[PDB]
Amino acid sequence: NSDSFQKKKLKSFTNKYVVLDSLEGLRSLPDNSVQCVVTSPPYNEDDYQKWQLQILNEINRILKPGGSAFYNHKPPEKFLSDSDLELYQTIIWDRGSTVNQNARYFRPYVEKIFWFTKSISGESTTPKFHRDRLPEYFKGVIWRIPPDKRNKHPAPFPAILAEICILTTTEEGDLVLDPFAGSGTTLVAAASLKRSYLGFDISSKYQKMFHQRLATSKSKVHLW
Amino acid sequence: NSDSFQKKKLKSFTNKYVVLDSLEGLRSLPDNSVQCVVTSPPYNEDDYQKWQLQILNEINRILKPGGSAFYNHKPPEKFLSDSDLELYQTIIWDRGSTVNQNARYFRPYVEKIFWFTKSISGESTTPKFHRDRLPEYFKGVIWRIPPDKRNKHPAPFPAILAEICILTTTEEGDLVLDPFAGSGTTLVAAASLKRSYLGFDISSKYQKMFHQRLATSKSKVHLW
Ligand SMILES: Nc1ncnc2c1ncn2[C@@H]1O[C@H](C[C@@H](N)CC[C@H](N)C(=O)O)[C@@H](O)[C@H]1O
Numbered sequence: 001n002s003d004s005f006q007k008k009k010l011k012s013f014t015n016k017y018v019v020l021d022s023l024e025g026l027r028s029l030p031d032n033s034v035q036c037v038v039t040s041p042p043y044n045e046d047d048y049q050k051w052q053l054q055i056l057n058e059i060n061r062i063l064k065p066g067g068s069a070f071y072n073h074k075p076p077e078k079f080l081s082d083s084d085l086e087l088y089q090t091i092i093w094d095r096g097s098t099v100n101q102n103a104r105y106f107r108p109y110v111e112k113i114f115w116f117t118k119s120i121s122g123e124s125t126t127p128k129f130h131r132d133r134l135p136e137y138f139k140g141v142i143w144r145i146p147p148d149k150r151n152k153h154p155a156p157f158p159a160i161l162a163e164i165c166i167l168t169t170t171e172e173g174d175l176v177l178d179p180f181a182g183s184g185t186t187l188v189a190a191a192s193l194k195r196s197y198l199g200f201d202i203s204s205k206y207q208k209m210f211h212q213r214l215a216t217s218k219s220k221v222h223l224w
Numbered sequence: 225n226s227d228s229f230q231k232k233k234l235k236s237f238t239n240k241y242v243v244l245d246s247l248e249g250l251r252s253l254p255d256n257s258v259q260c261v262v263t264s265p266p267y268n269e270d271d272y273q274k275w276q277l278q279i280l281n282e283i284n285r286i287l288k289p290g291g292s293a294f295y296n297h298k299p300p301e302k303f304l305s306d307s308d309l310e311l312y313q314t315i316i317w318d319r320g321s322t323v324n325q326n327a328r329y330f331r332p333y334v335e336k337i338f339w340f341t342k343s344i345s346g347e348s349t350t351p352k353f354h355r356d357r358l359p360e361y362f363k364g365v366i367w368r369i370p371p372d373k374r375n376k377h378p379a380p381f382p383a384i385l386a387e388i389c390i391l392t393t394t395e396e397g398d399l400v401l402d403p404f405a406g407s408g409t410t411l412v413a414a415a416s417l418k419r420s421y422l423g424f425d426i427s428s429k430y431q432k433m434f435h436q437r438l439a440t441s442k443s444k445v446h447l448w
């Protein structure tokens with residue numbers, strides 16, 4: 001009967017930005033219901049790693065077999081591997097430049113995008129992945145994408161980054177989830193690509209921004 | 225008296241390619257004797273991680289305070305963090321292209337260079353680092369360096385990669401160590417930059433290649 005409740009929530013949540021605690025929203029989705037997750041998480045250090053492990057394990061349950069979860073982390077690999085999710089590849093997001101010019105280290109203009117896939121009974125898989133759909137510029141493990149400087153959210157990623165993840169791992173109609181939706185970049189990208197979307201966030205402020213961002217965007221696809 | 229023996233070995237080993245087991249060679253160097261390590265390690269998976277941890281812990285002992293060890297790994301971060309070495313930054317070596325065009329993943333033309341520094345009493349440090357000595361092209365966390373396709377060694381890294389590590393972390397006369405010297409790329413780069421060098425490897429074949437490579441190179445600096 002929790003199956004029936006989760007399925008009911010899935011239909012009620014489809015193509016919605018839902019103001020809700022991230023873990024609570026994930027716990028209300030059915031097993032094997034989500035084809036693609038694109039998200040960048042927010043924020044005790046041991047408590048935080050415990051919380052993120054609960055997030056990743058719930059993502060593993062709700063991912064379809066062969067689904068993908070792209071997790072943009074702002075030693076992360078140590079705790080990220082303790083998860084039911086199987087780390088498939090680490091993508092390098094090259095932002096081009098950084099305001100941090102502190103010369104104690106090399107200029108840190110790189111963020112990681114961890115590409116996870118679903119593990120069934122502790123066994124591996126190959127994710128649904130269509131690299132041919134991308135321009136040559138984005139077929140490599142480094143994506144050169146300048147930050148979305150016009151976005152009013154304090155910390156988003158650009159739409160084209162979401163589009164790459166979604167277009168290669170989904171068909172039209174498939175459900176794309178972002179459990180930390182923020183300004184809704186993942187949801188707009190899914191909608192522009194004729195995928196279904198679902199966002200969780202705790203900001204009613206960000207939900208309204210998405211609803212207004214959704215109205216004024218003309219479904220433009222930044223890719224191609 | 226092991227101090228005295230190690231110091232004697234250090235003088236005997238300086239500016240030499242020494243055919244010797246890597247761990248044994250490291251165990252014969254004194255504490256706080258090496259300013260810079262540049263190396264790419266070779267090769268049971270649990271046994272291998274145990275072996276590499278012994279290598280890294282010995283490197284931590286022989287590093288000078290504020291010294292640097294650049295470790296090119298061909299979830300590595302999980303076991304790499306269990307070490308006495310403190311991971312300082314992960315550098316992205318962008319090789320430009322790969323022959324592996326398998327479309328199950330993004331083209332994997334990236335290798336990691338882990339920048340470690342010495343930990344004293346489980347406490348951090350800032351490594352000696354002079355970023356200003358580099359051309360702008362290499363001041364960022366991604367280094368775009370095509371592979372040394374003319375090198376007959378089955379798996380080297382290019383000289384310019386070694387030069388970047390050495391030039392930013394050393395003064396002339398400082399000792400540069402590569403405990404897996406192979407063709408001797410690290411040693412040639414140190415010599416061309418008027419640093420001292422020390423290599424360990426088990427191939428007498430590779431030692432001879434270094435001795436002949438050393439003679440025919442004109443100490444050319446690929447940097448600048
Ligand atoms: N416990 C939580 N549950 C759900 N959302 C949360 C929680 N804590 C923080 N958030 C949201 O997580 C988001 C993290 C953002 N970096 C995401 C930005 C988003 N990827 C974008 O492109 O706009 C913020 O918008 C927070 O409001």
Ligand SMILES: Nc1ncnc2c1ncn2[C@@H]1O[C@H](C[C@@H](N)CC[C@H](N)C(=O)O)[C@@H](O)[C@H]1O
Binds near residue numbers: 246264380405408430
């Ligand atoms: N136990 C060992 N001790 C020392 N050297 C070893 C050991 N096992 C393998 N090697 C060497 O480790 C090297 C690894 C190479 N990838 C290094 C290449 C080197 N960085 C270059 O640019 O030429 C090989 O040349 C092996 O001969």
